Design a protein around this ligand. Structure first.
Ligand code: FES
Ligand code: FES
Length: 87
């Protein structure tokens, strides 16, 4: 939401204004927390229940480091696209 006045209970919250780097395995599906509520960031732990928000599945083609979005405002979820810098 562009509006800055209020947090609505269905809005994502920032976990941190910085990515969560994670070494990922090729072909394994990761479930990114889109809501900011998970206690196991950057991954969903079911805490989204009650907000209407939902995790995003991410299956990398190859092994490497994925910089998952921590601020929850990336325009290219689930990965950091730098939006945290201006959020
Ligand atoms: S805990 Fe945040 S999307 Fe599931
Ligand atoms: S942590 Fe969200 S865009 Fe970088």
């Amino acid at each position: 939401g562009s509006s800055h006045h209020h947090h609505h209970h269905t809005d994502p919250v920032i976990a941190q204004k910085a990515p969560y780097p994670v070494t990922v395995e090729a072909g394994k599906t990761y479930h990114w927390c889109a809501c900011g509520r998970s206690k196991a960031q950057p991954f969903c732990d079911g805490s989204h229940k009650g907000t209407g928000l939902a995790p995003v599945a991410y299956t990398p083609d190859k092994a490497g480091t994925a910089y998952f979005c921590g601020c929850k405002a990336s325009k290219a979820p689930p990965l950091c696209d730098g939006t945290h810098k201006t959020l």
